[PDB]
Amino acid sequence: MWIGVISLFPEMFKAITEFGVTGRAVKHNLLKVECWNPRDFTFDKHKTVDDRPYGGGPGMLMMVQPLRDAIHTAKAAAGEGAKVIYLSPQGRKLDQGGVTELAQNQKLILVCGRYEGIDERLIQTEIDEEWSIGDYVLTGGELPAMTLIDAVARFIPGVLGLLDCPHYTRPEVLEGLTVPPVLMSHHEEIRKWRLKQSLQRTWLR
Amino acid sequence: MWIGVISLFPEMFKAITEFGVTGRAVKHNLLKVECWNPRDFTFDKHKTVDDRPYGGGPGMLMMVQPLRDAIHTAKAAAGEGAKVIYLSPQGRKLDQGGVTELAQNQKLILVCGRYEGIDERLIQTEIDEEWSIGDYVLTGGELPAMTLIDAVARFIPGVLGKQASAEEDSFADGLLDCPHYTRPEVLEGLTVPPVLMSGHHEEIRKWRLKQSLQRTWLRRPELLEGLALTDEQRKLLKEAQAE
Ligand SMILES: O=C(NCc1ccc(CNCc2ncc[nH]2)cc1)c1csc2nc[nH]c(=O)c12
Ligand SMILES: O=C(NCc1ccc(CNCc2ncc[nH]2)cc1)c1csc2nc[nH]c(=O)c12
């Protein structure tokens, strides 16, 4: 799988490409993540990446020209069939069904916004889909993009409905707490199944 | 605010401490994030961090001794009053109400797990709360912990600079945001809605509010279920629905 990323902080993506299961996927050439920074597409001395909203009010938007140019460079690296995803608080809320759908794509381009977001017309001209990772306020689209990468990477071949029952490992006595004698005795898929149901009944419905 | 982290991949947290809003909060001593790795608390040549579950079945659990020792080192650095959060796929699902609650803590310890998780007794003896960031499967607790840090850091006074505080900004949190536009005037032949160029503040506010209501209704109608609307919002939503 190939993933293109547009971000003002591309170095954040080292958390994905250098470590753990995604890092191992990168090392084994099962996953490739390439980043482009709108800052690198600026023409002015101050490398301006923000711009004022028409209609006023507080907040800024991503400046159109550096952002659009970075997207175009990612699209040229991707080639045909790359789906362009805008990480947005106004997007479809990610769940495992959404992850399964997004993981059918061999190529993705993930656009990360800063400030109050991006010009509405850029959504029409450049974006295929908008996605949120949850109903909470973040400072940008980078942690959502990284979260999406990790979730979809699990679907790449070679990379790898109730509340779980409690699980125990060594020692037998931990802070005076003992392991249920049943585990250590059989199977008996319950008490494991019975505890999984008991925990589901007493805590979440 | 001080945040202690337990993780097998502590270098991932540089994405938070070295960049953007959280990075500037670190540089300005408004936020401090310290990481401890259970692999640094191992005694064996192979630095073993996993262990077999009693009763068998598939999967491994994090080994108790290196994990608990790392938690204890974070607790000793924290001092009194630190709430210990375990990031887990079955914990309380994070939302803005949960963020606001978590943001009241001056000190937090975030425990990230790998494998199938941690020994039940460790939850009982070392963990205060369990939290999830969404109904999707991830490879570990690190991206959830970083997501939690970013969300709560917005509540630290001075982190949002001279702009409105997270509290003041929350006063409009119920609905999705309206579309926004910046230069150029014409982008691929597409123009900016004329009301935004009018300099008529109330007309702009009412257009943005009507758009916000229409977008919330079409994309996330569940957000409207548990929402008290003003007379104006009710009248505008009806207009957008009739158009
Ligand atoms: O870009 C992202 N966040 C930056 C961001 C956050 C909020 C606003 C709107 N601020 C105006 C306001 N004040 C009160 C109500 N509305 C604009 C931009 C993001 C991408 S995916 C995702 N998934 C979950 N959460 C996220 O924040 C994200
Ligand atoms: O630690 C986390 N994830 C790792 C993880 C995911 C699933 C399972 C269940 N094992 C099932 C299984 N066993 C064998 C095959 N499949 C265990 C651990 C996590 C922390 S907060 C969060 N919030 C949202 N999503 C997340 O994944 C998380």
Side-chain angles (χ1 to χ4, degrees), chain A residues 87-89 113 115-116 131-134 136-138 140-141 144, chain B residues 169 172-173 177:
Chain A
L87 278 309
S88 163
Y115 318 106
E116 287 307 316
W131 292 81
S132 172
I133 61 155
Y136 39 84
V137 184
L138 303 176
Chain B
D169 183 67
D173 271 13
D177 212 352

Side-chain angles (χ1 to χ4, degrees), chain A residues 58-122:
Chain A
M60 296 291 274
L61 294 181
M62 292 289 281
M63 189 187 178
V64 164
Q65 170 273 122
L67 172 64
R68 181 185 191 274
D69 294 347
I71 290 162
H72 281 30
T73 285
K75 285 176 70 75
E80 283 179 8
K83 180 166 281 191
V84 185
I85 285 105
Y86 176 49
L87 278 309
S88 163
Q90 299 88 218
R92 174 171 165 187
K93 182 163 73 182
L94 192 66
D95 61 26
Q96 203 55 16
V99 175
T100 307
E101 195 180 307
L102 288 159
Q104 301 314 109
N105 296 285
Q106 288 306 144
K107 302 167 180 183
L108 292 173
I109 291 166
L110 309 184
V111 177
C112 310
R114 284 273 138 183
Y115 318 106
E116 287 307 316
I118 79 175
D119 187 281
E120 182 65 21
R121 303 163 293 175
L122 280 180

